[PDB]
Amino acid sequence: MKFYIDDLPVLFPYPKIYPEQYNYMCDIKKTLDVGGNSILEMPSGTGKTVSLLSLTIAYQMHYPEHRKIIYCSRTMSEIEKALVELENLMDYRTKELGYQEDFRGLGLTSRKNLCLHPEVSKERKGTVVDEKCRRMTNGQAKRKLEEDPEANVELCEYHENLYNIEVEDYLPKGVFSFEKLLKYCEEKTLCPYFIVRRMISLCNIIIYSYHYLLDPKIAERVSNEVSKDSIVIFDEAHNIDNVCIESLSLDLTTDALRRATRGANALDERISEVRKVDSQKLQDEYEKLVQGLHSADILTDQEEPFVETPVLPQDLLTEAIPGNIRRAEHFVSFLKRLIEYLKTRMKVLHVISETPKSFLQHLKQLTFIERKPLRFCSERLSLLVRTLEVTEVEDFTALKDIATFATLISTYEEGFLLIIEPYEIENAAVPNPIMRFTCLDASIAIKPVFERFSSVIITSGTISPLDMYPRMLNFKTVLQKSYAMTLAKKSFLPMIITKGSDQVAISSRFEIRNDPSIVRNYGSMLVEFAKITPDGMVVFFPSYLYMESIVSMWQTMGILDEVWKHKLILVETPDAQETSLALETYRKACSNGRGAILLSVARGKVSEGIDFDHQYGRTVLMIGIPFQYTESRILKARLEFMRENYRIRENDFLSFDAMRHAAQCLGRVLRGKDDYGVMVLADRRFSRKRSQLPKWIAQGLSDADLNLSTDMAISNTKQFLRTMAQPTDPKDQEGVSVWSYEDLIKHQNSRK
Amino acid sequence: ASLVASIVEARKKRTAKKNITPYQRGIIRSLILTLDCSEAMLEKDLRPNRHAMIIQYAIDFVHEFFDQNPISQMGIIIMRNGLAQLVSQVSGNPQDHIDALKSIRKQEPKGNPSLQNALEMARGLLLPVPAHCTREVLIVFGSLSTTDPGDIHQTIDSLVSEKIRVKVLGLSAQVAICKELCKATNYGDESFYKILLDETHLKELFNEAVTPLPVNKINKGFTLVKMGFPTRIFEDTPTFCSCHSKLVYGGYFCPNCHSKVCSLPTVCPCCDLMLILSTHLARSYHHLMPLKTFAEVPTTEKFRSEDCFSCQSRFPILTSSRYRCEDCKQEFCVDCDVFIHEILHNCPGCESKPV
Amino acid sequence: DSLSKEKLLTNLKLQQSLLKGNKVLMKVFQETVINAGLPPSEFWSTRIPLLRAFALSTSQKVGPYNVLSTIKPVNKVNVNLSREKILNIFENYPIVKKAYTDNVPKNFKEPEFWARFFSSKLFRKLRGEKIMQNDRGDVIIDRYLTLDQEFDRKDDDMLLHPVKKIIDLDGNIQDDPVVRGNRPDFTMQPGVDINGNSDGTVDILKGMNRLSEKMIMALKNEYNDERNELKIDDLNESYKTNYAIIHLKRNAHEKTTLKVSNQQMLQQLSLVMDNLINKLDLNQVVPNNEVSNKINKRVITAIKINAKQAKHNLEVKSTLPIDLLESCRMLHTTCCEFLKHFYIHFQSGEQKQASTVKKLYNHLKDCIEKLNELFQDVLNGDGESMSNTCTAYLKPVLNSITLATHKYDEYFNEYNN
Ligand code: SF4
Ligand SMILES: [Zn+2]
Ligand SMILES: [Zn+2]
Ligand SMILES: [Zn+2]
Ligand SMILES: [Zn+2]
DSSP states (O other), X not given: OEEEOSSSEEEOSSSOBOHHHHHHHHHHHHHHHHOSEEEEEOXXXXXXXXXXXXXXXXXXXXXXXXXXXXXXXXXXXXXXXXXXXXXXXXXXHHHHHTSOOOOOEEOOOOSTTTOOOTTTTTOSSHHHHHHHHHHXXXXXXXXXXXXXXXXXXXXOHHHHHHHHSOSTTSSOSSOOOHHHHHHHHHHTTOOHHHHHHSSTTTOSEEEEOSHHHHSTTTTHHHHTTSOTTOEEEOOSGGGHHHHHHHTTOOBOOHHHHHHHHHHHHHHHHHHHHHHHHOSHHHHHHHHHHHHTXXXXXXXXXXXXXXXXOSSOGGGOOOSOOOTTTTSHHHHHHHHHHHHHHHHHTTOOSSOEEEOHHHHHHHHHHHSOOOHHHHHHHHHHHHHHXXXXXXXXXXXXXXXXXXXXXXXXXTTOOSSEEEEEESOSSSSSSSXXXXXXXXXXXXXXXXXXXXXXXXXXXEEESSOOOSTTHHHHTTOOOSEEEEOOOOOSSOOEEEEEEOBOTTOOBOOOOTTGGGOHHHXXXXXXXXXXXXXXXXXXXXXXXXXXXXXXXXXXXXXXXXXXXXXXXXXXXXXXXXXHHHHHHHHHHXXXXXXXXOOEEEEEETTSSTTTTOOOOTTSSSEEEEESOOOOOSOOHHHHHHHHHHHHHHOOOHHHHHHHHHHHHHHHHHTSSOOSSSOOEEEEEEOSGGGGOTTTSOHHHHHHOOSGGGSBOHHHHHHHHHHHHHHTTSOOOGGGSTTTTSBOHHHHHHHHHHHO | OXXXXXXXXXXXXXXXXXXXXXXXXXXXXXXXXXXXEOGGGGOTTSSSOXXXXXXXXXXXHHHHHHHHSOSOEEEEEEEETXXXXXXXXXXXXXXXXXXXXXXXXXXXXXXXXXXXXXXXHHHHHSTTOOSSSEEEEEEEEOOSOOOOSSOSHHHHHHHHHTTEEEEEEESSSOOHHHHHHHHXXXXXXXXXXXXXXXXXXXXXXXXXXXXXXXXXXXXXXXXXXXOOOOEEEOOSSOEEOTXXXXXXXXXXXXXXXXXXXXXXXXXXXXXXXXXXXXHHHHTTHHHHSOOOOOEEOOXXXXXXXXXXXXXXXXXOOOOOOOEEETTTTEEEOHHHHHHHHHTOXXXXXXXXXXX | OTTSHHXXXXXXXXXXXXXXXXXXXXXXXXXXXXXXXXXXXXXXGGOHHHHHHHHHHHXXXXXXXXXXXXXXXXXXXXXXXXXXXXXXXXXXXXXXXXHHHTTTTTTSOHHHHHHHHHHSHHXXXXXXXXXXXXXOOOTTGGGHHHHHHHHHHHHHXXXXXXXXXXXXXXXXXXXXXXXXXXXXXXXXXXXXXXXXXXXXXXXXHHHHHHHHHHHHHHHSSOOOTHHHHHOOOTTSOOOOOOBOBOOOOOOOOOOOOOOOOHHHHHHHHHHHHHHHHHOOOSGGGSOOSSHHHHHHHHHHHHHHHHHHHHTTOOOOOOOSOHHHHHHHHHHHHHHHHHHHHHHHHHTTOXXXXXHHHHHHHHHHHHHHHHHHHHHHHHHHHHTTTTHHHHHHHHHHXXXXXXXXXXXXXXXXXXXXX
């Protein structure tokens, strides 16, 4: 359906549309015309992404700016689903026009997902895949093979075909799904990793993860070829503060120092071998450090720096390497005594939380190691590894951590704290100690996104409320509001269970978690939903050890054995391969109608992008409040941190963040205006969290449902399944929840 | 507001029944009645038993189907304890099915379902079925799980290849597998998989399910059938029947081999031809031409008559229960209109109207 | 498969088993095949759906299930040992089948055998219970532990295959596998002790999982697409009943092998209105008891014949002896079987069946002579007084037999001559 908005011809692949999506597109168009930022809470039971794609394609083709559009996603599965949605959209628009328009827009992922060389791809670790792909495709391999054809450091045929052909002739114009381009590059023996690394400037739009946005090692590399004036759109980035912190927080082990000593000793022995063959390469490196040439100055673009950038590219140094570490032997001895300092600061007895300034002051007090060499150590080590040709870096890969930490702590001192603890494992036979680094502000990595792009547009599904996100991130929007659906009748059924059918108060606190009476209550609930579950049902808990503890004693006393006769059960395996095979079995079980029951963490891998619908999304349990573990020093420092800066209350934030995780888990049931289910919540303290609930979620929640028990919960689920076990008149939703185009026109005339 | 609620519920029913169309429907039918003795139907949530009201309502359905569709033949497969069983194959005799039903009533139900086994031997029962004889199976299920010896999807595709349409009637709620079964079995339609809410709605589902089903153009079976009536002779001697070899005072003659049979509508056992009467073909002309609904006029207008055209009773005033046949332009009462549409098959107002 | 009419005729052992199950089918079989000489191939050729029903009844098996989770031992535990449960365990667990196949005939007897099998560690281990090292079990079955572990690794190897891409979470975890952040808590790691050894709940989860994939491969035995499953029909056109309507045209033809006028009907209407407004007389209607007597004569003439029919308005009681009665019953039944096969012969419409029609017509002529000598024997042994009953009783089947002979003769003269 091709209709008109105020200035733009807008197409839709369906004959029908929802008003929430329509007004959402209207507000997006207003935000595009005004420029700047916006935060919009969409109703997660509305199809959003296809409307987004239709509006962006129409905006790009008709608007004479023709700004690039940057989709920003979380998971490769989300990227692939968006690829399928866009391919449906462009097929529709090609059929509508009678022709395909010129366009390119693709995804982005790793070599481990993209190495079509069958030998390099077979390695389990993506670090090993990247290392071997470097070793035989880095151009050093090509130069060795060109100099000596007998020099058997080979090249990938998929790599070499991309230089046999041209970069614009890598693909025919259009949009390719990931399986489609993998089939194409298998047919023509092409490397899609280097293809998509060469498609960054060439595609009109882009979609990728958040790691290649935030982590500076993989951030500026994408950010070079993208336009300054592009359109930025996010998706479900409510947990991006965790990703920002984990991109800038590091820990230390005794294994790290041991591996550092071994790598430094083997590196110095190789330096002795290199100086006894030919000191010319090291002399050339030393005079290039005298001149002050960096890794980008000396290395080509194909070869990459060995120690990738720990700090932001805005926080890099441009002057020369100091004379203390300018010589290779002097740098190696300096690194050795740095490891000596790290070892003698490693052996503490109790918990210390010091500043980077305090660490640097004690560093200069004890030894004579300075902040500018600690910044330059990463570049110095990368240039040393490139010159030395030490390609077996298995002993040498640990020193990347030390150079990363040194350049991080010698650049960052405020908004960051250095934590030193004597217990790497608190529940251990022996105390391994640890130094911890803490990222405390999440606005730092999204700051260069803010000053790089004006049209930064932010959205998610269950982001409620909005105000603390311009607190935790130092920004503001020109406009922000939220959206709830104008559904015909309620088909998601939220209620709060504070008590079992025995009327016993229920919770999942980390102290009273091993309370066997409340456990017996919990399994009476498990029995009663296991007896009644038609297709699928999922239970989450705040902590996977506690899941394993309760399911272990459950199997021990046999209620799992007797509920075995109803359905199957799957639990989130530690290996995500086994978890994927488990999801395949559950998909086949709901396909044949046996059905299974799922267990995973509210902060687990299933909770961050996995969808369930119409037999998979049928009902989801949450037992207790999904809190983060309380005695995390990083958590307490961040809690204090955000209170001193943005006056953010600790317990209020903890409750709000637990509700954010719970709402993110519970949003994996409803897709359009056709799915249905019962939303069951099990804690006493849930009743005071309607404000922390999203607007549409708490809209279906009743005040009588704030305190319910298992018996009338069972009753209400029965009358629910009898209710939508029956059909419904289309005329009850013909123009009030679903619109025709004529219904849209009639609403437009009603508004004007 | 009680009459207003009754009027708007009758409007919703009328919107459901607006599609009064003269579709060609399944007349030469072959039926399989899949039943289950599993332990799920032992539950006393239904009073006296799920299996109890299954037995009596199945007896009622047997009687209603043999009345409304006499020429068809219907079989009974019982599921019990991991392997389904056959107690009655397709026959023109209800008595055998009724005796099997009361034998099941006398016995206890217990077990666990194997729907693939039930479908496989149902497939073998419908294997020597002629193309004009439409193949249909009715499904009841009181559980939410089924273990099966092999995969169900090859069975699904094979039964789709065998050109079958099947209704499934579940107990608790909708199951995705049975929804997919009715979808692929019924060319994407999922109106064939329905769940009850109480016993009244259950009986209404039975009364709907007695009726034949309209047939598509794409599965065309346009042919002829070689039919012949028998001749009743009220004979003066105990005489052997062809089937059971027992001495009967009177009976029929075959139109070809002149043999006698006990009952109608039955095939010949000897020269092997379907022997019916005009009653059996006469039973479904109200399917062949239906009776469209009658115009309930409003109380605002003046009326031609203020009393019923048919039962001759005076019409009430707040609402106007004067229901006008569009084929006859005569208003009738709600009582006569409901009775004529449920039982009768001609409008006496249209008999009054000359053409 | 073995589902053709040829294969149903081929399964002679199944025919033997069902014949041995039935009784009157046995008696029919000896009278036709053994006494009269009917070939078996066309004995069973009229019973092909019954053969198919027996073949389906014999050729079916049940769904797999977990024998172990269901069965509890319930102090020597009592056992309701079922051989069906034993074979359920056998083709559930080929390790148990292999432990069976070398122990009953060689090492120890069957009851001491299954006593050791209930005693064994592998019993409670493969049962829904983590194995305890305190348990003594059965040391003979303890040699099967590493054999079953080899079976576990081999089954994992054959089960392992490339995973569908959109479902695969390995692409998600390998999307950015070079992330060096911080590891999660003790919460997210599996349940281990202070020595780091696990409780084995992941191992029993693997075992029940592997049970589910054995169910999946039991379904997946001898006995692109992403676009459709990602397509959504919620905002699409509903399915249309493309059913054809029927219309009627009606023109009934009249049957194949005086008129009053408007003036006449008007004047008779005038007369009858004159008589109606004139007079009605009550007692003029009584008949004169002679015309009423002939009325009674006609009524009683109807009553006599109709009530004589109504005098004769398990079967009826018979004066026949039971031996002669059953002999005429079975001869009648087999002659009906002949005549149904004769309609199979004649309605076949093939020149291929000509010698079959000839030889069967000889058999029918033998049946005719059997009936005639039967009636002669009942005549001379009973003085005809009930042999009249026997002949009148068997009369309609021999009448249709004669009808078949006359049809064969008339058609023979039509096509031959
Ligand atoms: S060029 Fe591509 S396919 Fe070849 S080794 Fe490198 S990543 Fe693998
Ligand atoms: Zn009979
Ligand atoms: Zn006949
Ligand atoms: Zn009336
Ligand atoms: Zn009428």
